[PDB]
Structure 1
Amino acid sequence: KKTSFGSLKDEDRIFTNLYGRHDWRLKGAQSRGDWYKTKEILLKGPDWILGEVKTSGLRGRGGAGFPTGLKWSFMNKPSDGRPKYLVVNADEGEPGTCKDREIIRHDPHKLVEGCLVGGRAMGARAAYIYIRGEFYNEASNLQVAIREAYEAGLIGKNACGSGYDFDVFVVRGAGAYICGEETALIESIEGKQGKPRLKPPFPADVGVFGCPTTVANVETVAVSPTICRRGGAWFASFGRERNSGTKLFNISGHVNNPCTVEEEMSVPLKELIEKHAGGVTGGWDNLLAVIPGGSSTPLIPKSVCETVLMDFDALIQAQTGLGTAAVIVMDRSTDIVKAIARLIEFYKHESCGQCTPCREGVDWMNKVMARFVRGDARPAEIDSLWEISKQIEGHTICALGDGAAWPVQGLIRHFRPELEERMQQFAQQHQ
């Protein structure tokens, strides 16, 4: 069995047009292997397609990491009279995360083909793609690719000459991070405020327009055709156990070369920064902390970044999570309190306001953290702030409440001395 992960070869990379150095339109994508033998895949049936996703070990790439094959099989049932839909989550709102953008604008035909194959596995009649409204130029690229697929018979009536009917629709957001939440996305497509629904019912029973629905991330949908062509076993030969496959990474912050790159799951975080991002600005020893999977994940200090792997289970044991695998690097000259406070301000601006612990609690944590930045607090407030975040976490309708509590807890967990020190500075300045 494999033991060390990384050094992904170019022949085993899925998004082979990540940087846009090749023609993104149909002609280029087909020449790179997209849309190949899709008819053969469709005619093998939904049970076969769902089997390959299950074996591949694929897990949701939107932030929660649920096993994709098991989740998609929820819709593998007979029709009860209603249409069935696939909703592709291209909202791409989590701060630090910009991977889904490159797929839409440079690899659009993998997303369109993934919609058809993934849509077949679920028995869905059409796919609605929800792309955030700020991605106007990327939404326009996606529409052009969709028209090309329609004009070649790949999607629509008798898709790929398969006897299966499939429409791909693009619907644009209007500026709301919460609409990336799976049920808040559905409510937005239906024309309401982007406010999450409680569960149950689950989307696979009552979804968009009250119909069976699956919400899947762009990267999750855009790798299924390759998983079917090359086999789930090939995909399962990467990463650790229950952390299979290749993964797109965004390295931003205080690195020499911020970039988006594909890499193997379970790659060491140190290796990913050094090999692809050109190292931490000022040398590895200048590293202060890393937010490894988007603003929703807790930060981790340099002493934990030395050996930590980049996968769902390795980061969970480091008291964080892989999330969207968006690495934000903070070197030793960062004001760590201010950086986290700016994240709580973001969550304050993004809360939908529906439910009490987030509508009131997140705003409350924002005010406390603004004072913590200046030191205008007492040390006893640190434990109060921890307890407040625990009242938000696990008590809200959606996970945005959890995603606002975790970054606060990560800060207090690893940088309490910096919090207490700053309060002591403020107290002496005003004595």
Structure 2
Amino acid sequence: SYPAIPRIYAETTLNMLLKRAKKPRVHSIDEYLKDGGYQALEKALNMSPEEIIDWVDKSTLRGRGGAGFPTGKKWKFAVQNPGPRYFICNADESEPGTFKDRIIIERDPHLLIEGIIISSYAIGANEAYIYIRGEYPAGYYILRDAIEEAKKKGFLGKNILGSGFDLEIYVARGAGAYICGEETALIESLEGKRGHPRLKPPYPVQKGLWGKPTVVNNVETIANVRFIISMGWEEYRYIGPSDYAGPKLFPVSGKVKKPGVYELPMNTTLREVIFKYAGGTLGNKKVKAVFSGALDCFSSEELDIPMDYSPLGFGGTGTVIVLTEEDDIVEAALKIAEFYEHETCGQCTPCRVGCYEQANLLEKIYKGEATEQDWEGFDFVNRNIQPTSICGLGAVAGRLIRQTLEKFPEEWEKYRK
């Protein structure tokens, strides 16, 4: 018995990450084994760590946490440095509009766990961690139980299936800080401290948990490892376009008829996501904007871009928040400002002060109480959150809002007039 979870709609054209998680329920180990679960692990333990790294490299799998760093190269970087090494699954998923990782956690834990074990073995880590946000309590208990199940079927513990490889997966809980999704702050939290990002360099692959080589990979990244081993890198790359191959999860919300998670190839266009898959818009209103989480803002001019990692592609995490023609852009921007205000950890002064002032001033604008100086101030702080910032939050806390200013001037101008 687990806490109540809303039944998010899930749909797939590729039937990989959502083969089971398209069904809104906990798939336990037996049902997992039935479809050939844990056989990729078995195959992996009969391979060298170097070869697994090679396959993940050649698959062109890239991180799904937002920074988009090649996974195999990441792993290769860590194994250049003496052990012991640690593997961390990043399940903090707290950016507005993003709910894709949780459906893997809640419906198909063993897809995740199988990935962690292969990955850990690939980098020689005997200690792995899932860091899951505190507001995902059902995910927490589902993971713990699925870990117990894996242990009893002999997939975890010492000398896993006679291989000589030992592994324990510990499940840690967050407690309300979006910044703890930043990998260095994640590691700080795991070491029992506040979620304060560390200055880079050094980089975790060199110096992370207890100063030791540490690979942090997103849940959805890890969800792909089973498949790369199972089908081989060459069959894997045949999925979608040669350039950006592989399955990808798109959490679609806002003013669409069918909000939910969609598993699609990355040659899909943003327009297709909205109109082909998510049923179009509510009331068939015209799309005004798409928020790529709390990162970017695309106009209705920019729908025909691919959902990939090309220069001109959507990028980000595939998070699609749809706003239609009656949605007030300033109102929406304020909500973004508020998020950043609540999530700056405050160690960098321009970020600390910017996030605060951007929200406070924008709220005055919104309420029609801004002075002429408040307006110029707002403009100014929005351009000056980033300086001296030691992590990406401060780099992007102004980004989306700046884009709305540049793409919807007429609607802002009305607030100024």
When normalised by structure 1's length, the TM-score is 0.90
Name the SS of the counterpart of 1:170 in structure 2.
strand
Counterpart position of 2:162: 161
The aligned counterpart of 1:34 is 37
Deviation digits for residues 91-150 of structure 1, max 9, x if unmatched?
A: 011110001101111110011111110111111112111001111111101111100111
Q: How many residues align?
A: 407
Match of 1:412 in 2: 405
Answer yes or no: is the 8 Å Cα contact 2:40–2:227 preserved in 1: no
Aligned residue type for 1:51? D
> Are the counterparts in 1 of residues 131 and 174 from structure 2 also a CA contact under 8 Å?
yes
Q: Which runs of 5+ in 2 are unaligned?
A: 1-10
Per mean C-alpha deviation after superposition, the further-off stretch among 415-424 and 83-92 is: 415-424
**Residue in 1 that maps onto 2:188:** 187
Distance 2:16 2:235 in 1: 12
Matched, 1:317 2:318: no
SS in 2 for 1:317: coil
Once the two structures are TM-superposed, the CA of residue 242 in structure 1 deviates from its matched residue by 4.0
* Displacement of 1:183: 0.4
Task: Confirm or deny: 8 A CA contact 1:238 1:265 kept in the other structure.
Answer: no
Partner residue, 2:357: 364
Match of 1:288 in 2: 288
Checking the alignment, whether the CA contact within 8 Å between 2:361 and 2:375 is kept in structure 1 is no
Helix, strand or coil at the partner of 2:296: coil
Deviates more, 1:269-278 or 1:165-174: 269-278
Give CA deviations for 1:19-43 in whole Å, capped at 9, x if unaligned.
Answer: 3357611001111222014222122
- The amino acid of 2:93's aligned partner reads E
> Matches of 2:150 and 2:81 in 1, distance apart?
28
Once the two structures are TM-superposed, the CA of residue 351 in structure 1 deviates from its matched residue by 1.0
Distance 1:66 1:94 in 2: 19
- SS of corresponding position for 1:205: coil
2:129 alignment counterpart: 128
Given the alignment of the two structures, is residue 390 of structure 1 paired with residue 387 of structure 2, yes or no?
no
CA distance in 2, matches of 1:379, 1:246: 49
**Which residue identity is paired with 2:275?**
E
Q: Which stretch of the first structure deviates more once superposed, 131-140 or 70-79? A: 70-79
Judge conservation of contact 1:386–1:412 (CA < 8 Å) in 2. Answer: no
Aligned to 1:302: 300
* Residue of structure 2 in register with 1:73 after alignment: 76
SS in 2 for 1:325: coil
Structure 1 counterpart of 2:88, which letter? V
The 1-side partners of 2:321 and 2:343 are apart by 20
Other-structure match for 2:202? 201
**Secondary structure of residue in 2 paired with 1:129:** strand
Deviation by residue 1:230-283 (Cα, 9 ceiling, x = unmatched): 112222223445422110111000111111121111211111112321111122
Q: Which residue of 2 aligns with 1:421?
A: 414
SS at match of 1:329: strand
Contact between 2:98 and 2:319, CA under 8 Å: does it hold in 1? yes
Structure 1 residue 15, shift from structure 2 partner: 2.9
- Output the CA distance in 2 between the equivalents of 1:72 and 1:266: 27
Q: CA deviation at 1:392?
A: 2.0
CA contact (8 A) 1:153 1:161 kept: no
Query: Which amino acid in the other structure matches residue 206 of structure 2?
Result: D
Aligned residue runs from structure 1 range 257-296, under 5 A = 257-283=258-284, 286-292=286-292, 294-295=293-294
User: 1:83 maps to what in 2?
Assistant: 84
* C-alpha contact 1:115 1:127 (8 A) present in aligned 2: yes
Q: Partners of 1:172 and 1:8 in 2: how far apart?
A: 30
Contact 2:13 2:263 in 1 (8 A): no
Render the CA deviation track for 1:286-341: whole Å, top value 9, x for unaligned.
2111013x11x211111212x1211121xx436xx521211000011111111111
Relative to 1, partners in 2 of residues 1:160 and 1:272: Cα closer, same or farther, differing over 3 Å? farther
Moved more, 350-359 or 34-43: 34-43
Query: Counterpart of 1:397 in structure 2: which amino acid?
Result: I
Hey, what's the Cα distance between the residues in 2 that align with 1:241 and 1:377?
A: 51
Matched, 1:59 2:62: yes
The Cα of 1:375 is off from its aligned counterpart by 4.2
- Structure 2 counterpart of 1:109: 110
Amino acid at match of 1:136: P
Counterparts of 2:26 and 2:358 in 1: how far apart (Å)? 47
Moved more, 55-64 or 268-277: 268-277
SS of the equivalent of 1:57 reads coil
Deviation larger for 399-408 or 179-188 = 399-408
